[PDB]
């Protein structure tokens, strides 16, 4: 490690780029850290800082960069020194060390400053906060001590700081438990949503936050959060319908809202009471012809089959274009039974091999779709097995889908595949072993 002592002495009498590298690999480092400090209290040097801080005993780091220093650095006019302080703070041990100072407060002050244009500083602060937010004392400093501030930034709805706040909440929600959840910061009232409409970028951002919020509730299994967010969901739908008073919503925000309604149709709730009401009063799936394809690609297929079976029956036909609809509509048995009569081996076999495989890979995903494939479209299975030139297929998508179809079927087991087991295994073997 004599390579680091050289750097320590070539500052007192390319190279940094090399230390930066020779450090991704792995005595007393204070002296070296002290110097980088002096230089900062006056770009590439930062990558060196971000490497050496983690690998050191934080007590050591804390001797050079004291709480008082960090504070001073953050209050300075020197961006690089601010980034460096962020790296130091990010590596706090224990993570709750600075939770009793105003360090977090200042991190937030800089974070929500519209005047800050340095995207590198913003992410550094966001990484610091993410890292430390596993600690409960850091969450207390954030959501208790700084709640009034966060809520005021929330109320600004000023473009630059609003985007940052939304990122902040999404990041933070990962670490929030039921008892710590505070509506006033994570949720928006009806009145705030109507207000965000005046600047459609803010509203669009708010729509995406909610989509992601519901997505995260579903992924993290935080269903206790639903009772807090679902009360304003009908508002997004009413605005989507109200083109007379709120034309900017359909005009600029149709797609982001469609994604939201996709999530709403999937919330763990008392049998679509919420979505059924939103659909009945506002969305009216089926009434606007230009939206039908999208509704059939996005909305819960079980909902679609119970409340809009006529649409599903009439509108869906097999083609390269309806593969989006196919992936969605077939993920519920009952909804699949509503499109079953639109398939035949002949209809599928007319498609170019790429789409055949996309269709087939889709049908191999579930028990009931596979059964139908084996029992009703064996000639399509024959096209899947092939003539003996599939190993010569150059298109990456085609190979990807075929292989995935082969895999999906094999995952079903020998007993359920009958006479197809051996040929499937054989074809899969040739695909992944090169033959």
Give the residue from 228, 229, 225, 223 showing the smallest Cα distance to 206. Answer: 229
The SS3 assignment for 107 reads helix
- 143-166 in b/e form (b: 16+ CB < 10 A) is bebbeeebeebbeebeeebbebbb
Sequence-distant (≥ 6) Cβ neighbours of residue 380 within 8 angstroms: 345, 348, 349, 356, 360, 373
**DSSP per-residue codes, 236-298:** HHHHHH-TTT-HHHHHHHHHHHHHHHHHHTTSS-SSSHHHHHHIIIII-TTT-GGGHHHHHHH
Give the residue from 401, 412, 398, 403 showing the smallest Cα distance to 369. Answer: 412
Task: Bin 157: left if φ > 0, else alpha if -120 < ψ < 50, else beta.
Answer: left
The CATH number of the domain covering residues in 282-435: 1.25.40.580
Identify the H or E element spanning 168: helix 159-173
DSSP 187: -
Cα–Cα distance for residue pair 7/343, rounded to 1 Å = 70
Give the residue from 322, 374, 309, 327 showing the smallest Cα distance to 351. Answer: 322
Domains 1-281 and 282-435 belong to one CATH topology:
no
Identify the H or E element spanning 303: helix 301-307
Give the residue from 282, 283, 337 showing the smallest Cα distance to 306. Answer: 337
Q: Cα-atom radius of gyration of the chain, to the nearest Å?
A: 28
Cβ atoms of 137 and 99 closer than 8 Å: yes
Cα–Cα distance for residue pair 33/19, rounded to 1 Å = 14
The CATH number of the domain covering residues in 1-281: 1.25.10.50
Task: Please give the resolution of this entry in Å, rounded to 1 decimal.
Answer: 2.4
Tell me the C-alpha to C-alpha distance, in Å, between residue 276 and each of 269, 304, 307, 403: 11, 10, 8, 39
Q: How many CA atoms lie within 13 A of 40 on its CB side?
A: 27
Cα–Cα distance for residue pair 329/333, rounded to 1 Å = 9
Q: Alpha carbon 403 to chain centroid distance?
A: 27
Cβ atoms of 37 and 43 closer than 8 Å: no
Per-domain boundaries in the chain: 1-281, 282-435
Give the residue from 30, 103, 18 showing the smallest Cα distance to 62. Answer: 30
Cα–Cα distance for residue pair 383/360, rounded to 1 Å = 10
| Length of the chain, in residues | 435
Burial class (CB in 10 A: 0-12, 13-18, 19+), 194: middle
Helices (H), 91-146: 103-111, 119-132, 136-140
Helices (H), strands (E): how many in the chain? 31, 0
Cα–Cα distance for residue pair 247/434, rounded to 1 Å = 57
Q: In degrees to the nearest 10, what's the CA dihedral of 153, 158, 161, 165?
A: 60
Secondary structure of 274-288 as H, E, C letters: HHHHHHHHHHCCCCC
């Amino acid at each position: 490690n004599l390579l680091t002592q050289l750097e320590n002495e070539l500052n007192e009498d390319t190279l940094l780029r090399k230390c930066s590298l020779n450090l991704v690999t792995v005595m007393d480092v204070k002296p070296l850290l002290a110097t980088i400090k002096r230089f900062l209290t006056s770009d590439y040097l930062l990558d060196v800082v971000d490497k050496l801080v983690p690998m050191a005993d934080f007590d050591d780091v804390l001797e050079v960069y004291s709480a008082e220093d960090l504070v001073k650095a953050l209050r300075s006019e020197i961006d690089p020194l601010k980034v460096a302080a962020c790296r130091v703070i990010e590596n706090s041990q224990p993570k709750g060390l600075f939770a009793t100072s105003n360090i977090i407060d200042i991190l937030l002050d800089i974070l929500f400053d519209e005047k800050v244009e340095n995207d590198k500083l913003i992410t550094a602060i966001e990484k610091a906060l993410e890292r430390l937010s596993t600690d409960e004392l850091i969450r207390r400093r954030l959501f208790d001590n700084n709640l009034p501030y966060l809520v005021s930034v929330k109320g600004r709805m000023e473009t630059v700081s609003f985007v940052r706040l939304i990122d902040f909440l999404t990041i933070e929600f990962q670490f929030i438990s039921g008892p710590e959840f505070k509506d006033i910061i994570f949720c928006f009232t009806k009145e705030e949503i109507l207000k965000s409409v005046e600047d459609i970028l803010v509203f669009i951002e708010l729509v995406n936050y909610y989509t992601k919020f519901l997505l995260e509730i579903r992924n993290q299994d935080k269903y206790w959060a639903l009772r807090h967010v679902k009360k304003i969901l009908p508002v997004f739908a009413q605005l989507f319908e109200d083109t007379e008073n709120y034309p900017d919503v359909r005009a600029f925000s149709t797609n982001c809202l469609l994604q939201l309604f996709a999530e709403v149709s999937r919330i763990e709730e008392d049998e679509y009471s919420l979505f059924k009401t939103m659909d009945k009063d506002s969305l009216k799936i089926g009434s606007e012809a230009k939206l039908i394809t999208e509704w059939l690609e996005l909305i819960n297929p079980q909902y679609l089959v119970k409340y809009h079976k006529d649409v599903v029956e009439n509108y869906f036909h097999v083609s390269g274009y309806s593969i989006g609809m196919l992936r969605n509509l077939s993920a519920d048995e009952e909804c699949f039974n509503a499109i079953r009569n639109k398939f035949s081996a002949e209809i599928v076999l007319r498609l170019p091999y790429l789409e055949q495989m996309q269709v087939v890979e889709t049908l191999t995903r579930y028990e009931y779709t596979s059964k139908f494939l084996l029992n009703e479209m064996p000639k399509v299975m024959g096209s899947l097995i092939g003539d003996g030139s599939a190993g010569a297929i150059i298109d990456l998508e085609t190979v990807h889908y075929r292989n995935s179809a082969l895999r999906n079927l094999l995952d079903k087991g020998e007993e359920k595949l009958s006479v197809w087991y051996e040929p499937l295994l054989r074809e899969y073997s040739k695909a992944v072993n090169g033959k």
